[PDB]
Design a protein around this ligand. Sequence first.
Ligand SMILES: [Zn+2]
Lengths: 49, 213, 242, 84
Amino acid sequence: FGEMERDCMIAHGAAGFLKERLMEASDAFRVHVCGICGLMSVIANLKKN
Amino acid sequence: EDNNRIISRLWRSFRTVKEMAADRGYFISQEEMDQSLEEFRSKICDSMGNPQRKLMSFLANPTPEALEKYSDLGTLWVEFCDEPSVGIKTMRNFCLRIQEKNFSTGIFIYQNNITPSANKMIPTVSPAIIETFQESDLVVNITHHELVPKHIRLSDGEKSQLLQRYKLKESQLPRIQREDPVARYLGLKRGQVVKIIRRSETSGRYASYRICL
Amino acid sequence: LIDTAVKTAETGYIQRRLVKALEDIMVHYDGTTRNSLGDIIQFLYGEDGLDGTQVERQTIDTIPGSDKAFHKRYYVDLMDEKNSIKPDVIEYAADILGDVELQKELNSEYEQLVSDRKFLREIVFVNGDHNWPLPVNLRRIIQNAQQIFHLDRAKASDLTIPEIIHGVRDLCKKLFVLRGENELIKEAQQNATSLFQCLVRARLATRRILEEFRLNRDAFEWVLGTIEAQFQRSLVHPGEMV
Amino acid sequence: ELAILKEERTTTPYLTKYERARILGTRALQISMNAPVLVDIEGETDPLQIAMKELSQRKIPLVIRRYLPDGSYEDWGCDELIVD
Ligand SMILES: [Zn+2]
């Protein structure tokens, strides 16, 4: 999905289709970040909450 | 012979200086503007047929309308220099001459070049404003040219109204430079917005503003 | 084959530079064409607010022609019989010759058209090329108004002149590109549409309505409404990465 | 704080194509996950057809919030924007 096709889907204006093509249909990921320091260095554990 | 071309250059330069002094808001009577050439040769050249620059200086007072619309406008002093390579000498004495009568703006036309050590002698004449120009520049009035449209400097408020209509800050406008011939033709300073009225072939008349630095 | 092998990639890289240069210039909700951080590039998009797919080449009748033919086309004189509107095209042709009340109107309108002539001829289109892209196709609306209402013939009209002059004059001011009631918005609204007003005033003048198009009343109203509707449909859309 | 009242609104009153697009999309997405439909449901079952059928007769309850450039905005009801 080259940069030029990105430029075309910007020319049409479908922002949701782009946000889809570059997320769900490829590689989505989740990161827990802090709010004071602002880094992806949060040590998280879920089933213990 | 070679006399008439020099005399013609000096004449055109003087006329352009007067029109420049007319668009900035001051007052020049029509007996001075419509000067023909025999008056110039008869009243400027010596019996040898050679000029005296010290007989071309003059003072200028503002009109009432321009005094009302633009408040920070004093008087104008125009003096053509005498020496060719303007160094520290003529610059210093000229600065004293402006610091003497306490007038507000002076125009020091040079001929060939100005020395840099004297080019530092311009922030030393405050609160006045000395503005330098070369002579070989003002032979042609750039405003009668086809492309260049009208530039109209604004007042203090109207600017505030313009910044209210678009909800802006003074840094987010198209800019013009402090050294750009149609920006010193009007004598701009940092924070003054010139209005431009360009022609357009999709709506005829298009008004576009532009700020200085 | 060699030249073909050479230039295409050059043009491609050139296009990449252009696109990577111009890819954040938007049209915000009031006509400004700002970049990513507010440097107003164009104060009003395209100088007129129109789109790009909506304009068509049209002719502006006023510019070309000689003064005698222009006068023969637009001038009206109710006093003298020979140079007035024909009698067999209007029913009310007996209640006309003599009332200055209306020769006033006609004189003022003709002076306005002279102002448009000198304006467009001197300042803008210097060479005089009378063919330029503009919105709203007028002639199609005209002959559509002729077909839908059968208005052909052989018949006299019933349209009054004050509805004509006051109709066009009250139309030319309902064409909104910028709204609000501040003075700057009003002047911008005045300049944004001037060539188009010269077009409408150039087409729908009186003799070219009662002596060439031969409309009536209902069709006239339908036409003004149509012009308003289409002009309101042919504007740019805020949110358009131009 | 930055809103504009219901007399000073100065944006165009015509439903643009992008707005129409997102209204149809979102309303269809709501009609799909079992939401109350506000017209007479008859001979069409596709959610997009139902959404357009609602937009034709003007019954869609949503609020357009047009963000002006510098930070303010305006609030229009989807049942007063003149659908072309
Ligand atoms: Zn932390």
